[PDB]
């Protein structure tokens, strides 16, 4: 894992809340 082409993001459709780490 050298480059970061795709970051990490979570989303809770249960409460409508997402964000990227």
- Contacts for 9 with CB less than 8 Å, ≥ 6 apart: 18, 19, 20, 21
Distance CA 21, CA 17 (A): 13
H helix and E strand count, the chain:
0, 2
Residues in the chain, overall count: 21
Dihedral Cα 10, 20, 17, 14, nearest 10 deg: 0
**Contact by Cβ (8 Å): 11, 5:** no
Distance CA 21, CA 3 (A): 16
Distance CA 19, CA 21 (A): 7
2: tokens are 């050298």
E strands present in the chain: 9-12, 17-20
């Amino acid at each position: 894992g050298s480059k970061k082409p795709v970051p990490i993001i979570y989303c809770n459709r249960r409460t409508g809340k997402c964000q990227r780490f």
